[PDB]
Symmetry: C2
Subunit: 355 residues, 2 copies
């Protein structure tokens, strides 16, 4: 149906139907469905004129805000024009000769590594393990590796590797001098998970990637960041990333969003309640295998390869992600965002009529 | 005084004085002083919710708007997160082995080329030529060059190379298979200058860089673009540039700003009237040599090397650009933006008391 690299392709999908992109209910991009944080809307509106000046090239205020939030030194943080920029920055700044990625996973790790000239090795997740990362990867880590990229939780599976396994991997990487890059883009949605930022002080080989776009519903503004405790390496990252890459409005949102308790609480309540109901409902459908995603999306496997769920749902103005373009997966796999109860009901109503 | 790479460092300057950055009158960044275009303010305010979705990864609407403006195919255009991104994109997409830059000039050309591993050759402008680019550069163009970067008009001198000279350079580059990259960031301020976009159809070796930030006062939003008629090379540029690098609000501004006749007319009237008055006034001061800049800034040479005009003016809350960090120039050189009549009068009043 589509040849697009990533979800959120409402313009392309609308063209297939011959309708307006705003008429589609998009389940292919995983953005918090609750609207926009009040802290963000107000800030942008009341300070719009700040676009008349270049942002501070050093982003002192923005980095201090992110640093105070995590209670780490500001020099450990470099904001990017989306976490997507942070991925390209860490790949180019580390300039690995040999790197390992885990498949299926977000396509941009491989693209960034290829652009930097790296030999890429793939650790293949297995359907027999429910697509969860296992300790079998430890033996695959060798001294000649420069970096290992893990996504926690993984895109598209939604699975969070076990904490003791991540700790074992971090320790093995420390011993073998391998940089461990942890993509925590979706970790904000799992309240009881702290991630690895609290453990960076004694682990300069670990790099954490964060995004504010999924959780705070600001993907159009573009804001993410990189965190690491190696003084020299972070200084090099600041030189590698293009000047003024974070726009002024994105910086203003990143300065207030992390303190928006109302939005955070509403988001966790919504996901805990509606997330479980949606997962349960999907699990009942024949021919479907649903993986237990931990954030705001779920990976689905349709038993009947001859049935194109993306095409069938598009007829009902519902856009889902086909995971055929992920190495390791095939056309039987799809990913759907978790949205509002009413929105989820529309998707369920459509799937039930197909299956 | 400062070690900053670029102008607009109001936060750093304010810290030296111990005051608030918004209390400084900044003459170190060259942004249109007229405020913000009405087309832009309205659009951003009435469509703020668009930040809840990723921008169209292909930026079809934005590129069609820029293309209709220049009356060229949309495939010839790639918008960037500031023209600064377009500079890094063209350097990385062309991957030159040998390139020539002209000094003094904007620092990012050299930074982008170094990041791509290029051997950089410098063509030195001369004080004896009033810092204008001359035909002496033609003999310096050799078959082994992959690219030549020219700025039209130049930063920091403000001088526009003669059109017949640019044509001669373009023709020599065509014959020698050299990509000619023309930085037209400031050309919008010179109304009777069309630049080279109208000549790209039969010249696939020419690349034009454009910026909307200086002329439309949106440097905090980040928007520029690259134009070129080589189908294959532009397709490669789209793959080289990071996904979703242009934010949604920047794209909305780029879709309407080029049709803001009221802003354009007010800008040209202001620059023609006030620009000439400011230049004339500066030329009267003893010990100063003022170059005839064609856009919204002027390069100044202070005869007395022992006098730090930047330090002296900062005392009066006026921030200017020291050009000591440009190869080819020394501490006697400074650059000042052309601002409103009242703002310019404050700067003049301060300089007269020093000289």
């Amino acid at each position: 149906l589509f040849n697009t690299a990533h979800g959120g392709n409402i313009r392309e999908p609308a063209t297939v139907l011959g309708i307006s992109p705003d008429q589609l209910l998009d389940f292919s991009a995983n953005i918090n469905p609750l609207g926009m944080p009040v802290s963000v809307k107000r800030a942008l509106i009341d300070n719009l004129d700040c676009i008349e000046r270049y942002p501070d090239a050093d982003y002192f205020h923005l980095h201090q805000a992110l640093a105070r939030h995590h209670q780490v030194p500001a020099s450990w943080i470099l904001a990017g024009n989306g976490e997507t920029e942070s991925i390209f920055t860490v790949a180019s700044g580390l300039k690995p000769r040999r790197a390992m990625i885990v498949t299926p996973g977000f396509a941009e790790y491989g693209r960034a590594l290829a652009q930097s000239g790296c030999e890429i090795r793939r650790w293949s997740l297995r359907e027999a393990d429910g697509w969860q990362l296992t300790d079998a990867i430890l033996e695959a880590l060798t001294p000649d590796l420069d970096c290992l990229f893990l996504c926690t939780p993984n895109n598209p599976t939604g699975l969070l590797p076990e904490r003791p396994l991540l700790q074992a991997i971090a320790d093995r990487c420390k011993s073998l001098n391998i940089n461990l890059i942890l993509d925590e883009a979706f970790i904000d949605f799992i309240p009881h998970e702290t991630g690895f930022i609290p453990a960076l002080k004694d682990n300069p080989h670990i790099w954490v990637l964060r995004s504010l776009t999924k959780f705070y519903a600001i993907p159009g503004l573009r804001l993410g960041y990189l965190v690491n405790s190696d003084d020299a390496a972070m200084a090099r990252m600041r030189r590698q990333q293009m000047p003024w890459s974070v726009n002024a409005l994105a910086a203003l949102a990143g300065e207030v969003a992390l303190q928006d308790s109302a939005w955070q609480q509403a988001t966790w309540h919504w996901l805990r309640e509606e997330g479980a109901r949606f997962y349960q409902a999907l699990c009942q459908l024949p021919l479907l295998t649903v993986y237990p995603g931990r954030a705001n999306y779920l990976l689905l496997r349709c038993e009947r390869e001859d049935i194109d769920l993306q095409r069938r749902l598009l007829t009902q103005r519902i856009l889902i992600r086909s995971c055929a373009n992920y190495p390791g997966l095939d056309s039987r796999y799809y990913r759907v965002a978790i949205r509002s109860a009413a929105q989820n009901e529309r998707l369920l109503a459509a799937l039930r009529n197909v299956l």
